[model samples]
Structure formats: C-alpha cells, structure tokens
Target chain A: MIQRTPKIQVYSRHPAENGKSNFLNCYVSGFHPSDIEVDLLKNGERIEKVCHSDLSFSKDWSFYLLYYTEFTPTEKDEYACRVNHVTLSQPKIVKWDRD
Target chain B: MIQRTPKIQVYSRHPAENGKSNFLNCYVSGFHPSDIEVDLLKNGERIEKVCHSDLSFSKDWSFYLLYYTEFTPTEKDEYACRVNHVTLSQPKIVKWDR
Candidate 1:
C-alpha cells in the first residue's frame, strides 16, 4: 500500500498589499491514494465559499491538492486550512501567517 | 524508497495584460525524497533569471517544488519548465504555449 502523511502549506499576500480582496493559497500534499477532502476556515469556522483545486501528482507516485480562496481579511480574523485524508489519524490544520 | 513522478503546470497572464513585465508561475510538484531540481526554460534554452520557491512538502509525505520567473516576452517567444528528479526516467519537459 502507498502510505503517506498529509502536509499543509498556507501562503498569503503581505499585509502591506493594497487590494479590495486578499487571496489565500492553501496547498495540501503528500497523501497516498487520491481521495481526500480539504476545507477552508475563517476564524475556526468552516467557510463555504472556498475553492478546491484539482488533484496533482508527482514523479514519485504521491498525490497532493491545492485550495485557494479570496476574502477581505481583518486583523481580528484568522484563516486556516483543514484537511481530511484517510492516512491521517486526525485532520491536518494549517493557518495563514506571515513569515 | 519513496518514488514519485513530477507533473508540471504553467500559468501566464493574458497577452492583453498591460504591464511593463509579465510574471509566469510554473509549479512542479510530486517529486520524492525531497531532493529534486527544477529549471525554467525559454525557447528550449535554460533561463537563469528565475525565482525558486521554498521546497514544499505535502501530507502524503512526498516533496514538491515550485519555480517562477518573469520576463518581457515578444510575440514569438516560448517558455517552458524542465524538471530533474530521481524518479523520472527522463527529464519532464513542459512548455508554456498560451
């Protein structure tokens, strides 16, 4: 069996970025098999207006996915990526933060 | 050994995109062992002026990489992505043909 532990990555534009909307690119990769679900959250609450990208594969036979969405974020709001994969004992959650 | 095959994705802005320059985002994902190399190409030749993003890991325990670059393209130029990974029998070459 192809066994894998899911990993999550979150990227966002700098706070200095001036725009009407902020785009959050959350990538979930390294899960074996291709059946997995990813959810986006805003301040611990699941957001229904999130986008799910198509499944992507690598040369090593592993699979990954990307979920991106946009919204105007306020300082008090926190954005997160919640992932559910069969290989994961628990859901994998990642937050959007600046480096 | 964790063996993986890398798939390449190329994205560009519209030609009508009005800017002094254009940013081309090329994503190479799904290489195993976290030790793979990615290159950006223009018209079958290697381009040095490119941005190499951090090596990203996915939940499945595989490693993938992203390389992005920008250039002022004329009407007749072509861009591509060249990947070198241990799992690939030959280098994976993907062209940007939009």
Candidate 2:
C-alpha cells in the first residue's frame, strides 16, 4: 500500500481580530489510506466545539479533511492544527499566524 | 432570538443494494440557533464512524448540517437518522427506507 503524508494549512475564515468572532479552519489534504486524525488546538489544548467536513478524495484518490471551530482570537492566545497520519513519524503541528 | 425547526432527510448516496458498500446521508437544514445534534443509526444504535460537514448558515440565517457514513446495507438491517434541536419538543428520527 502506498502512503502519502498530509499537507496541512491553518488559517482563519475571516481576518482575525481580538474579541471578534471568526472561524478557525484547519485544511488537511493530500493524504492516502484515509486513516487520519486532525485537531484544532488553542495553546496546546484541543478545542471542544469543533466541526469537520466530509472526508473526501481527490482525483488521485488521496484523502482530505477539514476541521474547524468558531472562535474569538486574541493576541495572547495561540492557535494551531495538529495532524496524525501513518506516513509521519511524529504528529505535525501547524501554527496559525495572524499575518 | 429566532427559532426555526430543522428539516431532516435520510437517504443513501447511491441506489442501495443489500451487501454493497454505499454512503448514508442525513441532511438537516433550515434550523436556527445553530445548536443541534445528528446521528446515523443502524438498528437503533449510533454508528461510530460517522462524519459531518461544517455547520453553515443559509442566506436567511438558518443553519444546515450534513452527517454521513460508509456502510454495507443488508436486507434485514434498519437505518435511521436521529436529530436533536432546541426548536423541537422531541427528538426527530427519520428512517432510511431502502
């Protein structure tokens, strides 16, 4: 069986501002075998009120999943997306930079 | 605050045949307040491998959610979608008629 590591992106659905409500999106794709775990984190803790998109596949049959949560971001808080797949030796944590 | 009862639909993504792998979709839409729970059930028990789409709002501000799972249906099996919302006085169960 061929294995492909996932590509993850962490971003906000809208321009994130302190005290303003927005959506945090963790877009994970380009993985194979379809067995994977994704979590949205704030300061290393999992966000409880999270939602996920349907597990979908690309034309090449690689799988993708989107995990998101409604949140109010602040400069003092850190947000990230954590991914676990068989293809990787360690869990990947991608930080969302409010740039 | 506005309250709207959700409309639920349960069906298979493809024409279901006994012993064939297919997707079961539970579509719940037209709800308000955005707080809801949806489950895919087989024989009155919840299926653990279910996945859901992101909660989204329509142009009129009502919410919608889609829950789905991959399964192999059989002639003797029963499938359903159970929904819980603040707008409903009781839980709603929509059966999947093969």
Candidate 3:
C-alpha cells in the first residue's frame, strides 16, 4: 500500500473581521487511506458543531476531507485546525492567522 | 438573492465491474443557498447507508455537496441519483447508465 501524507490548510471563508460572523474552514487534502480525524479548535480547545465532508479522492487517487464551522472571531480568540492520520507520526495543528 | 441552479453528475468511483464492490458518487455543485437534498437509488428506491458531505461554497459563493455510498452492481441493477433544490421546478433524476 502506498502511504501519502495529508496537507492541511486553515482559513476563514471570508476576510477576517473581528466580531463578525464568518465560516472557518479546514481543508485537508492529498492523503491515502481515508481514515482520518479532523477537529476545529478555539483557544486550543475543541470547538463543537463542526461539519465534515465525505471523504473524496483526487485524479491521482489521493483522498481529501473538509472540516468547517461558523464562528465570530475576535482578537482575543485563537482558532486552529487539528488533524490525525496514519501517515503522520503525531497530530498536526494549523493555526489561523488573523491579520 | 441570485438563484443559481445546481449542476449534477452521477458516476462510479471506479470503472463498472459487475458483482464487484465500488463507490457511487452524486456530486451536486454550483448552486446558491445551501438547502438541498441528494439521494442514491437502486431500482428507483432510496438506498440506505448513504453519506453526505457538509454544505460548502466555491470562490463565487455557489454551494456544493456530495452524496455517496458503497455498492456492488449487477446487470440487473439500476442505479440513479436524485437531487432536490430550490432552483429546480421538480426533482432531478440522473441515472447511472450501466
């Protein structure tokens, strides 16, 4: 079996604006073996009410999944997307950078 | 609000092979408003154990969703994907041509 690692991305659906309603997305793609876990976090803690996409594959047969949620971000809050897959030795955390 | 109609495609994940396990995917994309329903049918009846993706949008803000399931097909079986959206006057049925 060929093992491929996932690439993770964390970003807001719209341009970041503090205290405004927006969608946060975690797009994890380019992985083999569809079994994986994805979580959205606020201030390093689990954020509930997240929605996940059905596992999908690319033209090359690499799999991808999207995890997302609605949130109102403020300067005081920290947002992140965490992923766990067999291809990785440990969990990968990608933080959303609010500029 | 601009109402954009959805584009639907129904296909198997792998090349058709009678009596072999494969995934059937119904991809509905490029629509406005996230409210939509997708179903996989076997012989015109809804098939259970189906999985749906979260409502997502594209760069143009048009929405998309995917409904999929695992099945083993045979020459006697008829498969199709049914879609219901606000933009459509009636439910759209796209059959899997085996």
Candidate 4:
C-alpha cells in the first residue's frame, strides 16, 4: 500500500474583505491514496457547516486536500481541522484559537 | 483553476533491515494539475538514476506523487527533489542534505 501521513495548516491571518463575513481555510496535505476523509470542529465539537474543496495532485507520491469554514471570529472561539488518512491510526488535528 | 503548492518531506531515520541495503523515500505532495513534473538531483546536478512512482490523488483539491533513490548513506552525499506544477510560477525545490 502506498502510504503517507497527512499534514494540516491553518490560514487565519489573511485579511478579510469585510468586518463580519470572512472565510478561513484549513489545508490537509501530504497524504497518500485517493480515498481520504476530513472533519471540522469548533470548540472541540464537530461542526456541520464545513466546506470542502476538490482534490489536488503533485509529481511526488503525496496527495493534498483542504477544508474551510466561514466565521466572524470572536475572542473566544477555537476552530480545528481533523484529518483521517489510511496511513494514520488517529486523526491529525490542526487547531486555530482566537484570542 | 484548482491550485496548490508543493510540499517536500524526507524519511531517513527508519531502520534498515540488513543495514547495508535499504531504500529512502523522498515525498513531494500537495500540488495542482495532473500534468506536473519532478526532477531529482545530487550535488546540484541532475540525476538520471531516479525512480518515480505513479501520481496519487486526494479527496480534496490537491494531488501528490513521490521520488525515491536507493543509496547507502555515505558520510558525504546530498540529494534533492525538485517539483514543477502548473500552479507554480517557478519550480519548487526540496533539498535533502545527507
């Protein structure tokens, strides 16, 4: 089996177009096999309003994917992107905590 | 168009079976476009003895592939993996210093 571990990155520092409506992107990359899954969480709970994009590829053996959610960030919210790939026994989580 | 930047990772810490014969994998992931290319180099020169695997896909908007070369770890050897994708303005280079 062609196996690779998944990596997660958070993008929240980018400037938003407006004051109340904006989107944050959570990228999951470097995992193998076309069949993969992702989960989004806010405040440690599963979030239902997550958005997902199509798959991308590279010349190397690892694959890439992304998940996103829209929010007006408050001072006390925590957002997380959890990834599940065939290579990993546990989910890989990348978190963004607003202060 | 769907676009993503390439990422490079190296795996060399794993123990070899016989200590004299083993394979090292150089993985490059997370890029867009199916018609991407890869280049392997040693000491800043192109290496023709490179082995490439089939491209892999993800459920999201990114894709991946890998390059590997079998070499015994000498005290003085360096390797590099370079990738070129349609979304990148310039080729992305990932270097492995051995």
Candidate 5:
C-alpha cells in the first residue's frame, strides 16, 4: 500500500513591521510510517534527506510548538513554503508593518 | 574525499506571543556537486531528496536571498534548524514574544 501519513510541520520565526534580518526552519511527522520517507522542497529546489521516519515506528514526530518563537527580520523580505514538489503555503513577509 | 557544498537555507515563518498556529520550510544548494547530492533534515528526520544540485554545476547556487521572505505567525511557536544531523542554527521561535 502507498504509505499515506499525516505530517505535523513547525515554523521557527514570524514577522515584524520593521524588516531587518529574519530566518525560519521546519520538520514533519505522523504522516509516513517509520519506513515511508518525506521530501522537503522550496521553489522547486531540494533541501536534503530522502527518509523521514524510521521503521522502528517509535513515536509520532512531534516538536517544539510553533508561534512561541521569535524572528528578527532586516527591513524587508518575502518567503514561501513547499513540500515534495508541491507548493504548500504562502510567502511570509517579515516586518512589523506586516500588521 | 567527502564532497562539501555551500547550501542556501530559506525560512518561511516567524514568531508571536499571542499563541495560535505557525509553520516553516528550508532548501539548499551551491554546495556539493549536483550528482554529489544534498540532503536536508529536521530534528533528525529526513524530508526527501538525496540530491541537491545538478552535476552540470550550472549556477553558483544563487537565490532570492533570506531578507526577502515573509512569515505569518498566528500567535506563538518555538523552532530551530539543523543540517546533515548537525545543528547548524537554533530554534527560530515563531511568536513575537520569542
């Protein structure tokens, strides 16, 4: 059977009106079995890793809850998200003016 | 010799003390030879792709840069980064309070 799994994605940073210097990161879990793999992509570019979970099937991949983090953007910047050749989310703007 | 390549990491979200929902993503390049392959990981789990650039070494691996991205955080979240099992960065923290 095609391993269908649920994934929990987490983001590290947010946005501020005054863009300065900002960055972000993410991880997945609960989607594919320990054996199934997950692929992360950005703007059609590959990042790394062909395997996501282990066949050991330990615990569903859970991580630090998002939203509780902080971001320091420079003055202006735009970003987006994608998974396995698929555009998942939208471009996030960093800066307080984003309000 | 182990192939070493320069990689470009991009993030898609940021922080907030409000507490709600959030997310993030990253990609790499300009490092190992295309056929040499590149892999990105999170908290230890692999996302996919054993290769990053094309052996053609077509471009120097330039990108939209980091300063040009935006992240919409709902309220609060804690996050971090890592590369090749190595913790390259830290938890970005999504909420404004972070």
Candidate 6:
C-alpha cells in the first residue's frame, strides 16, 4: 500500500532576491482542489485565501493554479506560503518490461 | 539536467462508476495555473474543462487539484484529461546542512 503523507515546504525569493520577484506557487496535482486553504504573510498577519484561485479547472498547469506572488520587501523581511490537502495521488506499482 | 515534459492523461467517472465517482484528477505542481484545460467525457461529446476549478491559489496539496467527477454510467466509458505548460518544479538539489 502506498501512503501519501503531508509534506510542508517553505520557499521564498528572498534568498538574495537580486531585485527579482521573491515568491513561488507550488502545484498540487492528482486531485481536485475543492476545500483547500492558502495562507500568506501579509502585512505582518497571515491571511487565508478565503476565496478560491482564479484557475477553476483542475488537472495540471494547462492553466495557472497558485500565484507566484512577487513583492518588493521594504527592509528585507521573510515571507512564506502554505499548502494543505488530503493524499491526492494514488500509489501504483510500475511494471515495465524491456525487450 | 532535469527538465519538464508534457504528459496527457484521461480520466472519467463511467469507468465502472460503481455508483461511486471513478474519475480522478491529475495535479500540476511547480508553477501558477494561469492557463490549463481539462477535457472530459460528457453527454456523448468531449467537453473541455474550461474555467479553472474552485480551488484558489497553489502550493502543492495544502489544497486540492482537479475534480473527480462521479456519475452513474448507463454504459462503460473512458475519460481523459490534458496538462500543458512549462517546467513547474525546479531541479532541486539534495544537499542538506546536516
């Protein structure tokens, strides 16, 4: 049995942002994003997406899913986002035969 | 060098819907879903999954992706979907400071 576990990752563009956008949007495939929440550090307070993203269709990046938000920090601060959901992908055994 | 590739899959609820939803959604990680299309098996016609899904924002499945539609099939059928775009996930390095 393959079990899908919750993996939390924190990515920021502040790693020497170099005058560039310092944020990224992670992809969540294998399932539909119906009851998911996105939290971002905004104005020193964490805010939830309260509303769903613009991308309504689920499948893959045929469209945009999350927003790779970019913000210029006033004084080099740290910001991060969170992704939470159930085990979206099912586990399958790979059986390939080579000729 | 790691690179991203285009992979298309077909999913449907009529695959022995078994009075339950058999359709599954394939998620796309690594980039913002500004443009993605979903094609489904509906009403004897191939329907494009236009208009993004209900989930807002992205970041892996701290959220959901795609919809697993359920339907009572009068006959067995197949459903397929498509995912298109640039490489999403970066070629991450496996060096730990441990």
TM-scores of the models, in the given order?
0.46, 0.51, 0.52, 0.46, 0.24, 0.30
lDDT winner between 5 and 6, please give it: 6
Candidate 2 local lDDT, A1-99, one digit each (tens): 367888999999987778989999999888876657788888989889688876665445576778889998887999999898879999999999996
DockQ for all candidate structures vs. native: 0.04, 0.04, 0.06, 0.07, 0.02, 0.26
- How is the predicted docking of candidate 4 categorized under the CAPRI scheme? incorrect
Per-residue lDDT over A4-97 for candidate 1, one digit per residue giving the tens place of the 0 to 100 score: 8877888875462434587887887776765567888888988877776555666564766778887876657777888887777788888777
Clashes of 4: 18
Reference-based lDDT, each prediction = 0.72, 0.82, 0.83, 0.69, 0.33, 0.39
lDDT score, candidate 5, position A45: 50
**Tens-place lDDT digits, model 6, residues A1-99:** 222333334344345434555443443333342334445555455544433345444233222245345555444454555555445344222111111
Model 3: runs farther than 4 Å from truth? B1-98
Query: Between the candidate structures 3 and 6, which one is better when assessed by TM-score?
Result: 3
Worst ten in a row by lDDT for model 5 chain B: B61-70
- Write model 4 residue lDDT over A1-99, tens digit each, in one string: 356777778776456333476677888887776566778777898877687765666555466777787777665666777777768878788776442
In candidate 4, what are the lDDT values of residues B1-98, reduced to their tens digit? 45677777865545644336556677878776555667777677777787766655665646667777776665456666777777778887777644
User: fnat, candidate 2?
Assistant: 0.00
Residue A42 miss distance in model 1 (angstroms): 0.7
Per-residue accuracy of model 5 over A1-99 as CA lDDT, tens digit each? 234433445353454445454434444433332222233333355444322221122223221111122344343443233333122243322212333
Candidate ordering by lDDT (highest first): 3, 2, 1, 4, 6, 5
Residues forming the 10-long window of minimal summed lDDT in candidate 5 chain A: A60-69
What lDDT score goes with residue A62 in model 5? 20
Among residues 3 or more apart in sequence or in different chains, the pairs in candidate 3 whose N, CA or C atoms overlap within 3 Å are: none
- Tell me the tens digit of each residue's lDDT in model 6 across B1-98: 22334333334424353455444444433333233333444544544533324644444422234534444443454434444444434322111010
Per-residue CA lDDT of candidate 1, range B1-98, in tens?
45778778887754624335877777876666655667888889988777765555666756556677777767677788887777777887887775
The alpha-carbon lDDT assigned to residue B54 of candidate 1 equals 54
TM-score, candidate 2, is: 0.51
Off by over 4 Å in 1: A13-19, B1-98
Model 2 score (lDDT): 0.82
